């Protein structure tokens, strides 16, 4: 079609956290380099304590009671300074929730229609547009802390 390593901004968090999230290739990343790759690695390293609580010690109640929870972010992050810990809680989430659906498809559904136009939706277009380029992220995510 026009597959152009960028298609799109956020279909490439819907496919790579609930299409690759179940198979993380660590061979070839065509895709993005590593800005989200780190990023969810990263939280889902510290977060598991708090996720392997509600998906393993419980059954997720779907994104119903999930997107009030973390897509709460939002309608917080309606316009602050740099929350990139906000988007990363969803897309983090997705992440690792996307390996725990593969029992239960209920949160990998609206990580689809809600994820990736949330992630977008509430990052911002300025805030993406300067910020979201990947190779920033990808950067930045070291630069954190050297």
């Avoid at 993380?24 to 392997?52: A, C, N, Q, V, W």
């Avoid at 983090?92 to 949330?118: M, W």
């Amino acid at each position: 079609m026009d597959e152009d390593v960028l298609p799109g901004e956020v279909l490439a968090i819907e496919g790579i956290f609930m299409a690759c999230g179940l198979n993380e290739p660590e061979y070839l990343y065509h895709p993005l380099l590593s800005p989200i790759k780190l990023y969810i690695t990263g939280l889902m390293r510290d977060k598991e304590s708090l996720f392997e609580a509600m998906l393993a010690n419980v059954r997720f109640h779907s994104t119903t009671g999930i997107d009030q929870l973390g897509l709460s972010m939002l309608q917080v992050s309606g316009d602050g300074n740099m929350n990139w810990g906000r988007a990363l809680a969803i897309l983090t989430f997705g992440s690792f929730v996307a390996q725990k659906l593969s029992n239960e498809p209920h949160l990998r559904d609206f990580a689809l229609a809600v994820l990736p136009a949330y992630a977008y939706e509430a990052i911002g277009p300025q805030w993406f547009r300067a910020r979201g380029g990947w190779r920033g992220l990808k950067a930045y995510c070291t630069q954190v802390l050297t």
